[PDB]
Amino acid sequence: PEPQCPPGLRQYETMAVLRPDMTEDERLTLTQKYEELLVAGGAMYVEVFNRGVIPLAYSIKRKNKAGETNNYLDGIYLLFTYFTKPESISPLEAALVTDDDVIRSSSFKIR
Amino acid sequence: SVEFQVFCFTNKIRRLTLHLELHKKDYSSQRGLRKTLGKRQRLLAYLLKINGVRYKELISKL
Amino acid sequence: KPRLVLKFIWMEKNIGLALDQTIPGHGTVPLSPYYFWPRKDAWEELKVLLENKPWISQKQMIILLNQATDIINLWQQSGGNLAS
Amino acid sequence: PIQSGDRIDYRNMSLISRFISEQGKILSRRVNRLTLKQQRLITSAIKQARILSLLPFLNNEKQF
Amino acid sequence: MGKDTIADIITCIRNADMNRKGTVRIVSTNITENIVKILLREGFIENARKHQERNKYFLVLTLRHRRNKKGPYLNTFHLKRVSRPGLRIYSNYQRIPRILGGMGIAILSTSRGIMTDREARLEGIGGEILCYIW
RNA sequence: GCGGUGGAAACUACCAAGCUGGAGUACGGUAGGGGCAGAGGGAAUUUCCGGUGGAGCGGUGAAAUGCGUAGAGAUCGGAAAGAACACCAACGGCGAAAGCACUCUGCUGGGCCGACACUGACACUGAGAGACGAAAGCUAGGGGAGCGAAUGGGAUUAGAUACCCCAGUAGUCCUAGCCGUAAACGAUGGAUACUAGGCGCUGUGCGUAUCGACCCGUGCAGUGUUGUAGCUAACGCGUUAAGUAUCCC
């Protein structure tokens, strides 16, 4: 079902880990910035599914906007099996670095 | 098909050149541009060796 | 996947640890490797051989390593004392 | 063995962690007994999962 | 298919029998056909056969031997080029050499066809010496 | 030798016309530390800031200079900094060479394989030329933790401008250039054709086997190790020749 659209442009999958605290505006507001990606990308944007929060190995260094406070052991594991033009992925990187509830966001390009 | 080789290499040099001039330091693709120029140039000396008028058309097309 | 035997020998100076290993889903022939009288490592040599196999499951490697460890341990104590 | 059809990704933490040690370091091709292609692909995937802190960079030593 | 089509056949002959293999596969152009035609009839080789593989007509050529020896052919064949591409050689009907007195032959390109020393010495014609074997 | 003239057309050349295996292209795959740019990463080291505790720490062939009661080192936490990227790493992959390995993205080179899908010799080499070209060096500006020419002190020493040790500047890194040399080494210019094998590795292709990963043979290309023939003064090289030949510098 996914090989329908990739005549024309590319395919990706972004892994992004989250804060473990909030349960509200986490599925919501990060899907709203996924709608910011929808203004950017506008392709078969499906399967943005969530993975359960588990203890990771080692993480420090949240870098809140002038917080620089929280160490972590847990995080919500979002991954977006999205699909876009190869133009404007670096603004997705800046969007997934600058926002607070998204730390350590590594995108990929499955083949 | 020869004029698709010359025309295809011409679009190759267009897209690779507008890559390279806004980039300016890739010293690997410089060989690709120069192999394309030399390869196309031996094609143009080939079709000039065969014909007059037809190679004049290849000059006048681009 | 067949299952396994470490054989130890204690003589006062010298341990030998001997690892006899077995087949995965791929038909293989191990020896028993005997690790030797000089101070050259027995556990590292044995465990590394097992890891190099992957043909050995974790349970199998560990059970043999635990038995090997136990003998090296008894050997160290007997050598430091005179048990015999 | 254990190729299992589906390709090795960072999301597949079953065959991954059969390949690292408990000390958390990548084992070679002659130990893991794969092809060169399997080895490089789990290498890049394991280092990706190393970025996502799914896997430790160092495991603290233990006895008893 | 390199630069030369005659060092093609010839170097396949030397490289053929210096490894004692009594079988040659070469291309069959016009001048190769003429050389093996004026070479089977002079007792050096045994048979030349044309066939096809992908409708490309080739020559398989059977070399001479003798019986079970240290090497099954006694007289080493000793083929040699002369008129290299880039250094053409040309002879009158005077210069045309009797190779080793006559034990070798000098296949050469007359205006008639390509002859040997017998068939170009009686003619009185001369021409471009392709190669001489001995 | 040169010239005139009459004949021959195989070879070089010429004229014309086809041909495809040479060479390319189109297409589908495919592998990659190929290059450059942008983001991101964590160990470790050093320094600083705190809590502890109190006499050495560090170093060596043995010592010493140094640092330390102004609290060193050690230990735990907090920052910051630059530089390099452990295991994977393989007698492995790629690049024309130099080189290239933390990961991810973008642009982009090059290779390999198949079908005839196309053109029809477009080929090879290359004087002079042009590009790139480890490291050290230099101009300009940043940056500077570690290491460290010069230098300085201690030691060994008859002596020590040296090996050892403690500090340590240029440099190392980056931006933009210049320089254009190296054991820039495979001590082997490039290209094509042909000439035993064994044991390997990498990439793809076919058939077997299952119907799916294997696994066997293979078609090629590349990489390695023993080795026939032949060559070689010998050592050795040996389908990736230093073999047999042809061309070019």
XYZ file of C-alpha atoms (C1' of nucleotides) in Angstrom:
704
model
C 0.000 0.000 0.000
C 2.995 2.249 0.559
C 4.611 1.775 -2.953
C 1.707 3.694 -4.546
C 3.040 7.296 -4.194
C 6.916 6.965 -4.443
C 6.831 7.806 -8.081
C 7.825 11.416 -7.479
C 9.462 11.723 -4.043
C 10.988 9.919 -1.084
C 10.213 7.808 2.004
C 11.480 8.232 5.578
C 10.833 7.223 9.188
C 11.642 9.474 12.150
C 12.378 8.081 15.597
C 11.795 10.621 18.373
C 11.806 10.052 22.119
C 9.742 12.132 24.506
C 9.294 13.188 28.076
C 7.881 10.521 30.411
C 5.802 12.935 32.484
C 2.994 14.400 30.403
C 0.131 12.352 28.981
C -1.779 15.330 27.568
C -0.656 17.468 24.603
C 1.822 14.659 23.845
C -0.224 12.614 21.429
C -1.953 15.921 20.630
C 0.523 18.769 20.137
C 3.197 16.621 18.521
C 0.529 15.477 16.098
C -0.153 19.170 15.544
C 3.475 19.655 14.566
C 2.956 16.565 12.463
C 0.274 18.696 10.798
C 2.970 21.342 10.354
C 4.805 18.581 8.505
C 1.537 18.013 6.600
C 1.692 21.619 5.433
C 5.265 20.831 4.422
C 4.971 17.280 3.092
C 1.394 16.433 2.131
C 1.902 12.765 1.229
C 0.893 9.345 2.595
C 1.612 10.427 6.129
C 0.185 7.305 7.762
C 1.345 5.028 10.592
C 2.517 7.598 13.107
C 2.018 5.059 15.824
C 3.308 5.195 19.366
C 5.484 2.803 21.322
C 5.298 2.266 25.063
C 7.540 4.087 27.503
C 10.402 1.926 28.807
C 13.637 2.576 30.708
C 16.361 3.523 28.255
C 20.072 3.035 28.905
C 21.439 6.445 29.924
C 20.272 9.995 29.245
C 21.078 13.441 30.633
C 20.680 16.975 29.298
C 17.095 17.870 28.451
C 17.877 21.514 27.580
C 14.571 23.111 28.288
C 14.168 26.680 27.107
C 16.187 28.178 29.988
C 15.504 25.186 32.208
C 18.495 22.821 31.751
C 17.195 20.695 34.581
C 15.780 17.246 34.074
C 17.710 14.024 33.970
C 15.765 11.068 32.646
C 15.417 7.343 32.686
C 12.188 6.923 30.709
C 10.695 8.301 27.535
C 7.779 7.878 25.172
C 9.009 6.357 21.897
C 7.285 7.987 18.960
C 8.153 7.023 15.416
C 6.563 8.465 12.302
C 6.498 6.238 9.228
C 5.981 9.289 7.098
C 6.663 10.058 3.497
C 7.802 13.312 1.915
C 9.827 15.262 -0.585
C 13.588 15.206 0.080
C 13.404 18.968 0.211
C 12.551 20.272 3.703
C 13.844 17.563 5.978
C 16.304 19.867 7.727
C 13.321 21.975 8.960
C 11.885 18.739 10.313
C 15.215 18.300 12.077
C 15.013 21.809 13.528
C 11.395 21.216 14.507
C 12.375 17.962 16.210
C 15.335 19.523 18.001
C 13.964 22.876 19.159
C 10.684 21.675 20.710
C 10.674 20.784 24.377
C 8.877 17.435 24.490
C 11.107 15.978 21.748
C 14.675 15.054 22.620
C 17.161 12.941 20.624
C 15.342 12.732 17.302
C 17.011 10.544 14.666
C 15.298 10.246 11.301
C 15.985 7.415 8.884
C 15.322 6.365 5.308
C 14.049 2.802 5.014
C 14.433 1.123 1.630
C 21.187 6.715 -30.392
C 23.818 9.447 -30.529
C 21.982 12.750 -30.130
C 20.421 11.353 -26.972
C 23.970 10.768 -25.749
C 25.061 14.333 -26.566
C 21.823 15.859 -25.308
C 21.775 13.569 -22.264
C 25.350 14.537 -21.422
C 24.411 18.178 -21.911
C 21.640 17.928 -19.320
C 24.132 15.966 -17.186
C 26.557 18.908 -17.327
C 23.739 21.388 -16.655
C 22.503 19.675 -13.503
C 25.977 18.735 -12.300
C 27.284 22.245 -12.961
C 24.483 23.983 -11.090
C 25.267 21.485 -8.360
C 28.964 22.262 -8.376
C 29.045 26.059 -8.707
C 26.869 26.637 -5.633
C 29.004 24.063 -3.796
C 32.562 24.828 -5.065
C 34.825 22.311 -3.261
C 33.830 18.764 -4.252
C 37.009 17.510 -5.877
C 35.523 14.114 -6.657
C 32.771 15.140 -9.073
C 35.228 17.374 -10.941
C 36.452 14.192 -12.631
C 32.875 13.291 -13.494
C 32.357 16.647 -15.168
C 35.634 16.306 -17.052
C 35.014 12.716 -18.137
C 31.612 13.848 -19.386
C 33.167 16.769 -21.277
C 35.803 14.532 -22.837
C 33.385 11.720 -23.618
C 30.941 14.133 -25.234
C 33.844 15.800 -27.027
C 34.962 12.557 -28.626
C 31.343 12.038 -29.669
C 31.228 15.481 -31.284
C 34.481 14.847 -33.121
C 32.967 11.526 -34.181
C 29.781 12.962 -35.633
C 31.752 15.836 -37.136
C 34.016 13.200 -38.692
C 30.990 11.528 -40.268
C 28.938 14.500 -41.412
C 28.782 18.206 -42.103
C 25.144 19.437 -42.155
C 24.000 16.980 -39.493
C 26.721 18.048 -37.082
C 25.851 21.655 -37.929
C 22.377 20.734 -36.708
C 23.891 19.324 -33.518
C 25.650 22.654 -32.938
C 22.526 24.656 -33.765
C 20.337 22.602 -31.416
C 22.469 23.571 -28.389
C 21.618 -29.058 19.398
C 23.476 -31.640 21.504
C 24.664 -30.802 25.044
C 27.888 -30.466 26.689
C 30.943 -31.321 28.807
C 33.734 -29.386 30.453
C 36.454 -31.689 31.820
C 38.872 -30.301 34.365
C 42.072 -31.831 35.725
C 43.832 -30.616 38.899
C 47.495 -31.408 39.478
C 49.152 -29.075 41.927
C 51.059 -26.783 39.521
C 48.639 -26.817 36.654
C 45.011 -26.651 35.710
C 43.644 -27.996 32.556
C 40.176 -26.953 31.450
C 38.859 -28.936 28.495
C 35.791 -27.718 26.577
C 33.935 -30.347 24.540
C 31.251 -28.566 22.428
C 28.399 -29.561 20.202
C 26.386 -29.001 17.039
C 23.830 -26.254 16.231
C 21.323 -26.547 13.466
C 24.555 -26.868 11.364
C 26.486 -30.166 11.573
C 29.884 -29.338 13.149
C 32.724 -31.183 14.878
C 34.283 -29.633 17.940
C 37.102 -31.131 19.802
C 37.664 -30.963 23.460
C 40.150 -28.082 23.665
C 42.418 -28.447 26.647
C 43.851 -25.276 28.061
C 47.192 -25.596 29.189
C 49.800 -25.591 31.883
C 51.343 -22.106 31.408
C 49.561 -19.135 32.927
C 47.852 -18.431 29.586
C 44.181 -17.752 30.104
C 41.727 -20.618 30.272
C 38.384 -18.874 30.784
C 38.993 -16.230 28.120
C 40.193 -18.892 25.699
C 37.216 -21.137 26.424
C 34.477 -18.483 26.525
C 35.923 -16.760 23.427
C 35.931 -20.076 21.546
C 32.263 -20.494 22.516
C 31.361 -16.973 21.481
C 33.264 -17.501 18.196
C 31.151 -20.562 17.583
C 27.724 -18.853 17.944
C 26.661 -22.425 17.480
C 26.471 -22.549 21.295
C 23.408 -21.186 23.060
C 23.823 -18.838 25.985
C 22.587 -21.430 28.510
C 25.130 -23.936 27.232
C 28.091 -21.527 27.190
C 27.239 -20.252 30.668
C 26.788 -23.664 32.344
C 30.174 -24.821 31.043
C 31.787 -21.502 32.032
C 30.344 -21.765 35.549
C 31.799 -25.278 35.969
C 35.129 -24.037 34.530
C 35.131 -21.093 36.828
C 34.460 -23.317 39.850
C 37.440 -25.529 39.067
C 39.810 -22.595 38.442
C 38.594 -21.285 41.724
C 39.223 -24.567 43.603
C 42.597 -24.761 41.848
C 43.643 -21.300 42.990
C 42.765 -22.205 46.577
C 44.627 -25.543 46.472
C 47.673 -23.930 44.865
C 47.830 -21.153 47.457
C 47.572 -23.795 50.197
C 48.777 -27.327 49.970
C 45.475 -29.240 49.759
C 47.354 -32.363 48.654
C 21.736 -18.605 11.721
C 18.569 -16.592 12.554
C 17.888 -14.410 9.535
C 14.080 -14.712 10.047
C 13.073 -13.059 6.765
C 12.295 -9.585 8.115
C 15.191 -7.178 7.866
C 17.236 -6.121 10.868
C 16.216 -2.719 12.171
C 16.792 -0.919 15.446
C 13.164 -1.762 16.264
C 14.014 -5.496 16.281
C 15.545 -5.926 19.733
C 15.262 -9.728 19.623
C 18.079 -10.719 17.271
C 19.805 -7.550 18.341
C 21.096 -8.191 21.913
C 21.826 -11.711 20.781
C 24.752 -10.006 19.037
C 26.075 -7.647 21.670
C 27.526 -9.079 24.840
C 26.200 -8.349 28.316
C 29.163 -5.991 28.446
C 27.372 -4.286 25.557
C 29.919 -4.443 22.749
C 29.603 -5.677 19.189
C 30.847 -9.182 18.413
C 32.692 -9.973 15.193
C 31.599 -11.931 12.127
C 33.568 -15.054 12.992
C 31.919 -15.195 16.415
C 28.369 -14.333 15.365
C 28.721 -16.444 12.179
C 26.929 -14.402 9.635
C 27.725 -13.058 6.220
C 29.567 -9.802 5.725
C 26.272 -8.149 4.789
C 24.437 -9.253 7.931
C 27.420 -8.107 10.003
C 27.568 -4.604 8.543
C 23.812 -4.178 8.629
C 23.506 -5.144 12.276
C 26.552 -2.951 12.891
C 24.855 0.187 11.583
C 21.568 -0.830 13.213
C 23.215 -1.518 16.583
C 24.975 1.826 16.501
C 21.655 3.493 15.672
C 20.113 1.799 18.702
C 23.176 2.958 20.601
C 22.152 6.506 19.722
C 18.577 5.995 20.916
C 19.940 4.768 24.302
C 18.243 1.430 23.787
C 21.622 -0.146 24.447
C 24.283 0.855 26.966
C 27.666 2.101 25.889
C 29.172 0.456 28.931
C 27.747 -2.028 31.397
C 28.952 -1.781 34.965
C 31.104 -4.722 36.039
C 29.586 -7.265 38.406
C 30.509 -10.305 40.504
C 28.670 -12.861 42.678
C 40.157 -7.830 -31.502
C 43.143 -6.064 -30.046
C 45.359 -4.162 -32.421
C 46.448 -7.168 -34.463
C 44.414 -9.983 -35.941
C 47.574 -11.824 -36.958
C 49.359 -11.748 -33.631
C 45.896 -12.957 -32.575
C 46.238 -16.279 -34.400
C 50.017 -16.473 -34.047
C 50.185 -15.769 -30.334
C 47.372 -18.254 -29.882
C 49.609 -20.797 -31.632
C 52.691 -20.158 -29.481
C 50.625 -19.936 -26.302
C 48.712 -22.999 -27.438
C 51.537 -25.455 -27.825
C 53.981 -24.073 -25.265
C 51.401 -25.383 -22.808
C 51.219 -28.568 -24.999
C 47.482 -28.133 -25.658
C 46.720 -29.438 -29.125
C 43.666 -27.293 -29.872
C 43.234 -23.708 -31.060
C 40.092 -21.604 -31.263
C 40.542 -18.405 -33.262
C 38.467 -16.046 -35.340
C 38.117 -16.790 -39.040
C 38.759 -13.640 -40.992
C 39.889 -13.745 -44.612
C 43.622 -13.570 -43.944
C 43.447 -16.075 -41.076
C 41.596 -18.453 -43.406
C 44.299 -17.946 -46.010
C 47.137 -18.534 -43.532
C 45.665 -21.753 -42.199
C 44.966 -22.781 -45.794
C 48.648 -22.297 -46.653
C 49.633 -23.822 -43.346
C 47.702 -27.088 -43.133
C 49.066 -28.084 -46.542
C 52.654 -27.559 -45.380
C 52.651 -30.172 -42.643
C 52.865 -27.931 -39.595
C 49.352 -28.536 -38.270
C 46.797 -31.327 -38.678
C 43.295 -29.983 -39.327
C 41.384 -26.729 -39.394
C 37.632 -26.738 -38.858
C 35.206 -23.871 -39.234
C 32.058 -23.815 -37.152
C 29.804 -21.355 -35.346
C 28.947 -20.622 -31.726
C 26.636 -17.598 -31.909
C 26.687 -17.581 -35.725
C 30.308 -16.401 -35.563
C 32.416 -18.658 -37.746
C 35.559 -19.812 -35.936
C 38.596 -21.969 -36.631
C 39.549 -24.793 -34.316
C 42.961 -26.057 -35.292
C 44.629 -29.300 -34.268
C 48.376 -29.180 -33.754
C 50.858 -31.914 -34.418
C 52.310 -34.254 -31.858
C 54.111 -37.524 -31.700
C 53.952 -40.158 -29.187
C 54.257 -40.275 -25.312
C 57.501 -38.497 -24.662
C 58.930 -36.086 -22.132
C 57.055 -33.699 -24.386
C 54.743 -35.262 -26.991
C 55.928 -32.890 -29.736
C 59.659 -32.890 -30.385
C 60.229 -30.041 -32.840
C 59.190 -26.834 -31.104
C 57.076 -24.815 -33.489
C 58.759 -21.365 -33.219
C 56.340 -18.952 -34.840
C 57.439 -15.329 -35.277
C 55.982 -12.090 -36.655
C 57.915 -9.705 -38.869
C 55.850 -6.901 -40.399
C 54.602 -5.282 -37.244
C 51.820 -2.717 -37.507
C 53.628 0.569 -37.455
C 56.772 -0.913 -39.010
C 55.773 -2.387 -42.340
C 58.379 -4.488 -44.102
C 58.499 -5.002 -47.852
C 60.699 -7.188 -50.007
C 61.447 -7.605 -53.687
C 61.918 -11.032 -55.233
C 65.588 -10.713 -54.291
C 65.420 -10.125 -50.532
C 62.767 -12.876 -49.956
C 64.504 -15.147 -47.486
C 65.134 -18.862 -47.509
C 64.498 -19.456 -43.820
C 67.170 -21.818 -42.424
C 67.889 -22.851 -45.995
C 64.251 -23.769 -46.502
C 63.206 -25.579 -43.324
C 61.070 -22.557 -42.483
C 58.689 -20.655 -44.721
C 57.939 -16.959 -45.027
C 54.264 -16.347 -45.616
C 53.899 -13.029 -47.379
C 51.306 -10.967 -49.206
C 51.768 -10.953 -52.969
C 49.476 -9.282 -55.444
C 48.348 -12.803 -56.340
C 47.268 -13.908 -52.867
C 49.470 -14.926 -49.965
C 52.147 -17.424 -50.904
C 55.175 -19.129 -49.453
C 58.773 -18.836 -50.612
C 58.114 -21.633 -53.090
C 55.020 -19.967 -54.482
C 56.508 -16.479 -54.598
C 60.004 -17.397 -55.714
C 58.770 -19.081 -58.888
C 56.405 -16.196 -59.587
C 59.125 -13.564 -59.413
C 56.682 -11.256 -57.644
C 57.441 -9.693 -54.277
C 55.471 -8.163 -51.478
C 54.857 -7.493 -47.827
C 56.340 -10.247 -45.645
C 53.703 -11.085 -43.040
C 55.634 -13.536 -40.910
C 58.054 -16.405 -41.146
C 57.812 -19.663 -39.245
C 60.540 -22.240 -38.798
C 68.675 6.317 -55.576
C 65.272 9.365 -58.434
C 62.137 10.095 -62.653
C 58.904 8.514 -67.019
C 55.646 4.620 -68.671
C 52.855 -0.104 -68.901
C 50.608 -3.887 -65.796
C 48.755 -6.633 -60.457
C 45.307 -5.540 -55.990
C 46.632 -9.559 -51.235
C 48.314 -5.724 -47.057
C 48.559 -0.146 -45.296
C 45.813 4.074 -47.170
C 41.562 5.716 -50.039
C 35.946 5.621 -51.962
C 31.257 3.744 -50.812
C 27.957 0.409 -48.221
C 26.640 -2.810 -44.437
C 28.106 -5.628 -39.786
C 28.679 -6.370 -34.117
C 32.097 -8.991 -30.344
C 35.381 -3.539 -29.297
C 33.180 1.090 -27.078
C 29.138 3.745 -25.322
C 24.012 5.080 -24.250
C 18.767 3.986 -22.714
C 16.423 0.539 -18.708
C 16.108 -2.472 -14.314
C 18.738 -3.796 -10.209
C 22.917 -3.857 -6.988
C 27.255 -2.965 -3.261
C 30.196 0.740 -1.011
C 34.580 4.206 5.376
C 33.579 7.644 -2.940
C 33.259 13.062 -2.187
C 31.185 17.606 -0.011
C 27.640 20.114 3.090
C 24.122 20.318 7.410
C 22.474 18.357 11.908
C 23.077 15.023 16.211
C 25.770 11.659 19.663
C 28.545 9.475 24.055
C 32.908 7.548 26.555
C 37.562 9.674 27.882
C 40.985 13.744 29.128
C 41.851 18.637 31.148
C 40.306 22.842 33.759
C 36.887 25.264 36.923
C 32.804 25.105 41.059
C 30.968 22.671 45.247
C 30.851 18.060 49.659
C 34.489 14.587 52.165
C 39.383 13.823 54.157
C 44.352 14.972 55.673
C 50.068 14.103 53.662
C 51.702 12.836 50.102
C 50.584 12.568 44.772
C 53.188 11.893 40.347
C 57.511 9.763 38.127
C 61.861 6.189 37.356
C 66.700 1.297 35.646
C 67.226 4.052 40.500
C 66.233 8.873 41.647
C 65.137 13.974 41.062
C 62.730 18.627 39.015
C 57.335 19.348 39.683
C 52.858 19.639 42.422
C 50.902 19.339 47.842
C 48.776 21.988 54.860
C 46.937 28.136 50.483
C 44.291 20.832 51.524
C 47.301 17.763 46.472
C 45.981 13.220 44.601
C 41.375 9.872 45.519
C 35.872 9.980 45.546
C 30.590 12.037 44.165
C 27.922 15.758 41.771
C 27.810 20.332 38.615
C 29.249 23.003 34.203
C 32.488 24.280 30.036
C 36.071 23.279 26.357
C 38.395 21.369 22.139
C 40.234 17.067 19.622
C 39.660 12.096 18.238
C 35.837 8.483 17.322
C 36.791 2.083 21.413
C 34.364 -3.311 20.592
C 32.476 -3.807 15.236
C 37.928 -4.249 12.302
C 38.244 -9.083 8.415
C 44.761 -11.980 5.257
C 37.709 -6.971 4.873
C 34.575 -2.594 1.004
C 35.422 2.007 -2.011
C 38.534 5.713 -4.616
C 42.457 7.267 -10.333
C 46.153 8.048 -6.666
C 46.634 10.670 -1.884
C 43.252 8.783 1.014
C 38.332 7.224 3.350
C 35.222 4.198 9.641
C 30.399 7.443 15.600
C 25.406 7.892 13.344
C 21.622 10.311 10.349
C 19.920 13.513 6.185
C 20.606 16.247 1.545
C 23.289 16.942 -3.408
C 26.599 14.229 -6.443
C 30.722 11.118 -8.880
C 32.273 6.202 -10.149
C 31.897 0.744 -10.494
C 29.575 -4.163 -11.400
C 25.392 -7.453 -13.673
C 21.126 -8.638 -17.370
C 18.087 -8.005 -21.760
C 19.721 -6.932 -27.701
C 16.576 -1.773 -26.108
C 19.542 1.931 -29.231
C 24.356 4.207 -32.355
C 27.799 1.695 -35.372
C 34.389 1.639 -34.451
C 32.766 6.542 -31.813
C 38.907 2.628 -29.810
C 43.931 2.783 -26.892
C 47.883 5.983 -25.391
C 49.244 10.929 -24.658
C 54.395 15.098 -26.022
C 53.418 20.136 -24.274
C 49.013 21.130 -21.143
C 45.253 20.847 -16.944
C 43.425 18.975 -12.450
C 43.989 16.535 -7.769
C 47.776 15.423 -4.666
C 49.718 12.210 3.019
C 52.653 14.844 6.376
C 55.706 18.898 7.642
C 55.812 24.464 5.759
C 53.880 29.637 4.796
C 49.930 34.111 4.325
C 45.038 35.781 6.733
C 41.446 34.956 10.751
C 39.486 31.882 14.433
C 40.270 28.248 18.124
C 43.541 25.707 21.588
C 41.804 19.969 26.090
C 45.582 16.214 24.983
C 50.161 15.418 22.536
C 54.498 18.165 21.450
C 59.961 20.268 17.559
C 62.391 24.568 19.763
C 63.220 25.966 24.564
C 63.850 25.531 30.286
C 64.796 22.584 34.583
C 66.008 17.772 36.621
C 68.551 12.931 35.971
C 72.206 9.162 33.527
C 77.037 10.516 31.830
C 84.146 12.075 31.801
C 81.032 15.224 28.944
C 75.163 15.164 27.008
C 73.098 20.592 22.945
C 70.375 13.314 23.061
C 67.578 8.535 24.581
C 64.600 8.920 30.468
C 61.474 12.465 33.448
C 58.600 17.590 34.634
C 56.869 21.915 32.579
C 56.157 23.660 27.594
C 55.840 27.688 22.612
C 54.982 27.276 17.257
C 52.231 23.206 15.225
C 48.227 19.735 15.541
C 41.796 21.312 14.284
C 38.698 24.597 11.266
C 37.714 28.854 7.091
C 39.958 30.832 2.698
C 44.371 30.271 -0.151
C 49.731 29.308 -1.530
C 53.378 25.381 -1.568
C 53.386 20.383 -5.175
C 57.375 17.229 -2.335
C 57.251 11.617 0.411
C 59.967 4.512 0.941
C 53.362 9.417 -3.034
C 55.764 1.486 -2.892
C 52.821 -3.462 -5.621
C 60.080 -0.363 -4.995
C 56.002 -3.267 -10.963
C 53.077 3.287 -16.723
C 48.605 2.053 -19.483
C 45.434 -1.043 -22.941
C 43.841 -5.493 -25.635
C 44.247 -10.843 -26.965
C 46.013 -15.792 -25.482
C 48.280 -19.714 -21.756
C 47.406 -25.695 -15.693
C 45.209 -26.243 -11.329
C 44.103 -26.148 -5.562
C 42.410 -23.276 -1.482
C 39.689 -18.368 -0.387
C 36.845 -13.641 0.068
C 33.396 -9.693 -2.037
C 29.478 -8.361 -5.529
C 25.727 -9.841 -8.597
C 23.337 -14.136 -12.523
C 21.352 -19.132 -13.734
C 19.926 -24.044 -12.445
C 19.191 -27.826 -7.886
C 16.825 -27.969 -3.334
C 12.706 -26.461 -1.244
C 8.579 -23.159 -2.913
C 12.117 -19.645 2.137
C 16.091 -18.674 4.749
C 19.790 -22.016 3.533
C 23.013 -25.365 0.467
C 25.602 -27.120 -4.067
C 27.663 -26.210 -8.603
C 28.425 -22.567 -11.990
C 28.424 -17.276 -15.816
C 31.185 -12.998 -15.129
C 33.931 -8.763 -12.511
C 37.229 -7.630 -8.474
C 40.504 -9.037 -4.204
C 44.098 -12.968 -1.877
C 47.046 -17.259 -0.961
C 50.148 -21.893 -2.747
C 51.449 -23.359 -7.709
C 52.254 -26.099 -13.756
C 54.495 -24.038 -18.272
C 57.635 -20.129 -19.433
C 60.870 -16.166 -17.996
C 64.642 -14.706 -14.626
C 71.838 -13.585 -12.662
C 69.236 -15.451 -8.468
C 65.354 -14.446 -4.975
C 60.911 -15.101 -7.069
C 56.520 -13.750 -10.595
C 53.010 -16.875 -12.422
C 45.490 -15.328 -15.728
C 45.771 -9.173 -11.009
C 52.844 -12.384 -14.891
C 58.128 -9.966 -13.894
C 54.918 -15.503 -19.561
C 53.936 -15.157 -24.853
C 52.961 -11.088 -28.489
C 50.964 -5.890 -30.320
C 50.471 -0.585 -29.508
C 51.594 4.296 -26.759
C 54.390 7.450 -23.309
